[PDB]
Design an enzyme around this catalytic site. Structure first.
Site, PDB file in Angstrom:
ATOM      1  N   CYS A  24     -12.464 -28.127   6.673  1.00 48.11           N
ATOM      2  CA  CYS A  24     -11.217 -27.443   6.383  1.00 48.11           C
ATOM      3  C   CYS A  24     -10.062 -28.424   6.258  1.00 48.11           C
ATOM      4  O   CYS A  24      -9.900 -29.327   7.081  1.00 48.11           O
ATOM      5  CB  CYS A  24     -10.925 -26.478   7.525  1.00 48.11           C
ATOM      6  SG  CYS A  24      -9.416 -25.546   7.279  1.00 48.11           S
ATOM      7  N   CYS A  78      -6.849 -27.567   6.451  1.00 54.04           N
ATOM      8  CA  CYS A  78      -5.601 -27.002   6.939  1.00 54.04           C
ATOM      9  C   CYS A  78      -4.948 -27.909   7.984  1.00 54.04           C
ATOM     10  O   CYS A  78      -5.569 -28.813   8.551  1.00 54.04           O
ATOM     11  CB  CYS A  78      -5.804 -25.585   7.471  1.00 54.04           C
ATOM     12  SG  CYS A  78      -6.251 -25.436   9.230  1.00 54.04           S
ATOM     13  N   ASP A 106       0.842  -1.187   0.000  1.00 53.51           N
ATOM     14  CA  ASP A 106       0.000   0.000   0.000  1.00 53.51           C
ATOM     15  C   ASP A 106       0.884   1.246   0.000  1.00 53.51           C
ATOM     16  O   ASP A 106       2.094   1.183   0.233  1.00 53.51           O
ATOM     17  CB  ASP A 106      -0.958   0.003   1.192  1.00 53.51           C
ATOM     18  CG  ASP A 106      -2.148   0.961   1.002  1.00 53.51           C
ATOM     19  OD1 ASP A 106      -2.173   1.751   0.023  1.00 53.51           O
ATOM     20  OD2 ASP A 106      -3.065   0.925   1.846  1.00 53.51           O
ATOM     21  N   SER A 107       0.272   2.393  -0.280  1.00 57.08           N
ATOM     22  CA  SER A 107       1.041   3.608  -0.501  1.00 57.08           C
ATOM     23  C   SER A 107       1.334   4.371   0.774  1.00 57.08           C
ATOM     24  O   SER A 107       2.206   5.250   0.770  1.00 57.08           O
ATOM     25  CB  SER A 107       0.296   4.525  -1.471  1.00 57.08           C
ATOM     26  OG  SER A 107      -0.927   4.929  -0.905  1.00 57.08           O
ATOM     27  N   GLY A 108       0.620   4.078   1.853  1.00 56.38           N
ATOM     28  CA  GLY A 108       0.737   4.820   3.085  1.00 56.38           C
ATOM     29  C   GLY A 108      -0.340   5.862   3.286  1.00 56.38           C
ATOM     30  O   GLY A 108      -0.520   6.326   4.416  1.00 56.38           O
ATOM     31  N   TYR A 157      -3.656   5.780   3.334  1.00 53.90           N
ATOM     32  CA  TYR A 157      -4.735   5.419   4.249  1.00 53.90           C
ATOM     33  C   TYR A 157      -4.237   5.365   5.689  1.00 53.90           C
ATOM     34  O   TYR A 157      -4.855   5.939   6.593  1.00 53.90           O
ATOM     35  CB  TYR A 157      -5.345   4.079   3.826  1.00 53.90           C
ATOM     36  CG  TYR A 157      -6.429   3.553   4.748  1.00 53.90           C
ATOM     37  CD1 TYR A 157      -7.749   3.965   4.608  1.00 53.90           C
ATOM     38  CD2 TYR A 157      -6.135   2.632   5.745  1.00 53.90           C
ATOM     39  CE1 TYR A 157      -8.743   3.488   5.444  1.00 53.90           C
ATOM     40  CE2 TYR A 157      -7.123   2.148   6.588  1.00 53.90           C
ATOM     41  CZ  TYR A 157      -8.425   2.581   6.431  1.00 53.90           C
ATOM     42  OH  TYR A 157      -9.415   2.106   7.264  1.00 53.90           O
ATOM     43  N   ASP A 216      -7.598  -7.684   0.247  1.00 56.01           N
ATOM     44  CA  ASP A 216      -6.744  -7.819   1.420  1.00 56.01           C
ATOM     45  C   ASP A 216      -7.562  -7.397   2.623  1.00 56.01           C
ATOM     46  O   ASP A 216      -8.455  -6.558   2.510  1.00 56.01           O
ATOM     47  CB  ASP A 216      -5.520  -6.897   1.366  1.00 56.01           C
ATOM     48  CG  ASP A 216      -5.877  -5.440   1.651  1.00 56.01           C
ATOM     49  OD1 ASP A 216      -6.288  -4.722   0.713  1.00 56.01           O
ATOM     50  OD2 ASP A 216      -5.771  -5.011   2.820  1.00 56.01           O
ATOM     51  N   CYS A 240      -6.648 -28.011  11.468  1.00 54.26           N
ATOM     52  CA  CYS A 240      -7.833 -28.854  11.576  1.00 54.26           C
ATOM     53  C   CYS A 240      -7.514 -30.331  11.436  1.00 54.26           C
ATOM     54  O   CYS A 240      -8.319 -31.164  11.853  1.00 54.26           O
ATOM     55  CB  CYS A 240      -8.893 -28.396  10.578  1.00 54.26           C
ATOM     56  SG  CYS A 240      -9.510 -26.743  10.971  1.00 54.26           S
ATOM     57  N   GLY A 260     -11.634   3.887  -0.995  1.00 57.72           N
ATOM     58  CA  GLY A 260     -12.647   4.659  -0.304  1.00 57.72           C
ATOM     59  C   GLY A 260     -13.846   3.887   0.195  1.00 57.72           C
ATOM     60  O   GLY A 260     -14.828   4.506   0.618  1.00 57.72           O
ATOM     61  N   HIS A 313      -5.245 -21.351  10.568  1.00 58.31           N
ATOM     62  CA  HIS A 313      -6.550 -21.825  10.123  1.00 58.31           C
ATOM     63  C   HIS A 313      -7.321 -20.732   9.383  1.00 58.31           C
ATOM     64  O   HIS A 313      -7.914 -20.985   8.330  1.00 58.31           O
ATOM     65  CB  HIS A 313      -7.395 -22.341  11.281  1.00 58.31           C
ATOM     66  CG  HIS A 313      -8.830 -22.457  10.901  1.00 58.31           C
ATOM     67  ND1 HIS A 313      -9.318 -23.512  10.158  1.00 58.31           N
ATOM     68  CD2 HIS A 313      -9.860 -21.597  11.064  1.00 58.31           C
ATOM     69  CE1 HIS A 313     -10.603 -23.307   9.912  1.00 58.31           C
ATOM     70  NE2 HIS A 313     -10.953 -22.150  10.449  1.00 58.31           N
ATOM     71  N   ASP A 364      -2.590   8.187  -2.652  1.00 57.77           N
ATOM     72  CA  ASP A 364      -3.886   8.838  -2.776  1.00 57.77           C
ATOM     73  C   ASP A 364      -4.347   9.416  -1.451  1.00 57.77           C
ATOM     74  O   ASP A 364      -3.594   9.448  -0.471  1.00 57.77           O
ATOM     75  CB  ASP A 364      -4.936   7.833  -3.269  1.00 57.77           C
ATOM     76  CG  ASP A 364      -5.228   6.743  -2.250  1.00 57.77           C
ATOM     77  OD1 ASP A 364      -4.354   6.473  -1.405  1.00 57.77           O
ATOM     78  OD2 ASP A 364      -6.321   6.143  -2.305  1.00 57.77           O
TER      79      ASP A 364
HETATM   80  C1  LIG Z   1     -10.502  -1.522   6.075  1.00 59.44           C
HETATM   81  N1  LIG Z   1     -10.965  -0.576   5.076  1.00 59.44           N
HETATM   82  C2  LIG Z   1     -10.163   0.028   4.201  1.00 59.44           C
HETATM   83  N2  LIG Z   1     -10.637   0.904   3.288  1.00 59.44           N
HETATM   84  C3  LIG Z   1      -9.548   1.354   2.565  1.00 59.44           C
HETATM   85  C4  LIG Z   1      -9.410   2.290   1.550  1.00 59.44           C
HETATM   86  C5  LIG Z   1      -8.132   2.570   1.073  1.00 59.44           C
HETATM   87  C6  LIG Z   1      -7.982   3.660   0.053  1.00 59.44           C
HETATM   88  N3  LIG Z   1      -6.748   4.034  -0.286  1.00 59.44           N
HETATM   89  O1  LIG Z   1      -8.996   4.194  -0.418  1.00 59.44           O
HETATM   90  C7  LIG Z   1      -7.026   1.888   1.589  1.00 59.44           C
HETATM   91  C8  LIG Z   1      -7.170   0.950   2.599  1.00 59.44           C
HETATM   92  C9  LIG Z   1      -8.444   0.689   3.099  1.00 59.44           C
HETATM   93  N4  LIG Z   1      -8.856  -0.147   4.141  1.00 59.44           N
HETATM   94 ZN   LIG Z   2      -8.566 -25.350   9.417  1.00 58.36          ZN
END
Ligand SMILES: CNc1nc2cc(C(N)=O)ccc2[nH]1
Ligand SMILES: [Zn+2]
Ligand SMILES: CNc1nc2cc(C(N)=O)ccc2[nH]1
Ligand SMILES: [Cl-]
Ligand SMILES: [Cl-]
Ligand SMILES: [Zn+2]
EC number: 2.4.2.29
Lengths: 369, 369
Positions: free
Chosen positions: A304, A306, A93-95, A97, A266, A309, A216, A335, A142
């Site tokens: 499951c 895994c 991720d870009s940082g 958020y 994610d 389990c 968002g 798990h 962003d």
């Molecule tokens: C857990 N919710 C969540 N919404 C997100 C939106 C962004 C985003 N850059 O709009 C990033 C991470 C995010 N995590």
């Molecule tokens: Zn399991």
């Protein structure tokens, strides 16, 4: 040898797609779930265990890594892959958020913030940090608009994000080794507003990216509203590139988002809630701390596959979590991540076989029974 | 099929011995180090990882298990081996040390205590709890005399322990399934006093046990005094049975105790201090939290064969421990337990080859350089 980036769609059902992303460090099967590796670790798991659950790619957090242990330090040690022992693709991720969630002074240049020491993040510095980490999929820097947002504020924030997306593109392209070996995803913004989502999609497609995130969402709006926004937002993105829904989510969120054209996910839910005692099962989540599990010899989930389990009872894991034992966190997390990967595998197979709509219906009937 | 219990000495050098204990659930190579599994887990390790480090047997704590999750509960779930997923021998302590360390009203019948709910431990109840757990090596219930102790108090405590040793023997023998499938060790007491140690050894040999522990040491007396007591105490025990030094210890303590005829050891040091950042190396312990390791790409130890040293750097483990990450505890613990097992292997091989005295000298010169 694999290309820098190739996304191929092998099968479709409605808006749902299944296929592969080929990158230098490996193949990613889509729809894909990325376990989250916040501080250069998927919490409580060795990388070999992450891989054994079926994960093809993990997510790393730029905000955390730039603070500890430091991006320049990781680069000097050989990059994030070598440092943590995961040799497959990593999306960072870009940082943007986490800087607003966990740290601030915002401007057109970027964001200055105090660590939770003063620090700076801009499109250029974010791309540079992701390069120093050796990220395979780089996210544009962003601004994640808070929810709820007025139309005016959502527009101003989206417009800034689009200017930052162009700056991210140019910074990435200027760095030859990064441009030749990594991929760059742009992030659609616009809150819940269809016209802003369209403007954002158009701006990102004009710049051109290897993949497109729906940003968002999962910011407090609830599943009905998230699905409503996805209904009109995903079709605006280029069909032939991956669609990444950031920060989502619960199993039912994933299923419905795939029904709406999302290819990548994610979430910290399986790891974080696993450490807190929540285990995912095909009959819905359970809290293993509950006294009803103290003498339950069944595995966490009856189907499951895994290793947890196959080997340990609910009763034992109940004891470990109640006692605060590290092995409890390890077993719950393995798990839960394995469950998520089995969900993704069932999604991929059902799309490939043209029976995903039935799978989604059957999944929901049992999970919410 | 293996016998209930057979100890065979394959080689000797001075007072040191190397050999094997054969039991129904496996063979134990001696001198042996037992990782400690307090609350039905060796902290931060799956049992398969404990085994991969070379451990043949682990220790379980009666005091902790009788409180959580409960001995009757573990029995109803199939026993400690099934519950935690370790199918090899388990030695259980009797609870007598931990009840006085962690909880009390003492009498000739036993000890009543409040959990840290009121509870009771007597020779009979301790043996019963160890049966319910399914222990392979059962420890007699004793009284660990505090240090320092006056001769009078050490004598009174040792005499009570010998009466309790006979009660432990009779309780164990009364339970047919336990007597036929497990072994029973007696515990020598007597503080630092040679005449009391001799009286205790004589009493235990008259009762007859499968093995003999040296109790009452590693209670604050220091290595010089511990070695002085071992010098005269170990020769008092039957030569043809294993000699178990409870709660010891540091690598140099183990080496010197083997030089004095000890065959078995347990200690929380590798696990507990591993979680706190202390890593054992052939050049002495290091604290991985120290800033000097932040960019050190070498493994924890330059010769160690463990999976941690094959795969991760000091710099990465430094980061994990500083960040409080569970994987840091996992990696430090696996390495430290593997180091301890490699120490035991070098001890066994050097005795077998008649070069243990040289090994001990070389070990000390490097470890303390
Ligand atoms: C857990 N919710 C969540 N919404 C997100 C939106 C962004 C985003 N850059 O709009 C990033 C991470 C995010 N995590
Ligand atoms: Zn399991
Ligand atoms: C860590 N020291 C230590 N000394 C011990 C003595 C005994 C004993 N029963 O004399 C048991 C456990 C012990 N642990
Ligand atoms: Cl997490
Ligand atoms: Cl421990
Ligand atoms: Zn090692």
């Amino acid at each position: 040898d694999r290309p820098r980036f190739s996304f191929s769609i092998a099968a479709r059902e409605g808006k749902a797609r299944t296929g592969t992303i080929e990158m230098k460090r490996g193949v990613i099967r889509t729809p894909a779930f990325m376990p989250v590796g916040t501080a250069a670790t998927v919490k409580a798991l060795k990388p070999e265990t992450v891989r054994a659950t079926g994960a093809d790619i993990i997510l790393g957090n730029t905000y955390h890594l730039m603070l500890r242990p430091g991006a320049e330090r990781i680069a000097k040690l050989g990059g994030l892959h070598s440092f943590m022992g995961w040799d497959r693709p990593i999306l960072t991720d870009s940082g943007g958020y986490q800087v607003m969630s966990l740290s601030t002074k915002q401007s057109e240049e970027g964001v200055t913030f105090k660590s939770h020491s003063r620090h700076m993040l801009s499109p250029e510095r974010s791309i540079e940090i992701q390069h120093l980490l050796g990220s395979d999929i780089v996210m544009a820097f962003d601004e994640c608009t808070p929810y709820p947002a007025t139309p005016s504020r959502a527009a101003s924030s989206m417009e800034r994000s689009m200017r930052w997306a162009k700056r991210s593109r140019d910074a990435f392209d200027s760095r030859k080794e990064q441009a030749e070996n990594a991929a760059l995803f742009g992030i659609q913004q616009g809150s819940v507003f269809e016209n802003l989502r369209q403007q954002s999609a158009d701006a990102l497609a004009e710049i051109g990216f290897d993949g497109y995130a729906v940003g968002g969402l999962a910011v407090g709006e609830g599943q009905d509203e998230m699905f409503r926004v996805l209904d009109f937002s995903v079709p605006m993105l280029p069909d032939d590139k991956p669609h990444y829904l950031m920060g989502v989510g619960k199993p039912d969120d994933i299923v419905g988002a795939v029904e709406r054209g999302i290819d990548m996910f994610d979430c910290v839910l399986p790891t974080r809630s696993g450490r807190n005692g929540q285990a995912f099962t095909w009959d819905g989540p359970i809290n293993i701390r509950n006294a009803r599990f103290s003498e339950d010899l069944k595995p966490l989930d009856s189907e499951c596959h895994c290793a947890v389990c196959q080997k340990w009872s609910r009763a034992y894991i109940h004891h470990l979590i109640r006692a605060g034992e590290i092995l409890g966190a390890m077993l719950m997390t393995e798990h839960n991540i394995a469950f998520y990967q089995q969900l993704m595998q069932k999604i991929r197979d059902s799309i490939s076989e043209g029976r995903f709509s039935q799978f989604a219906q059957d999944f929901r009937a049992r999970y919410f029974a």
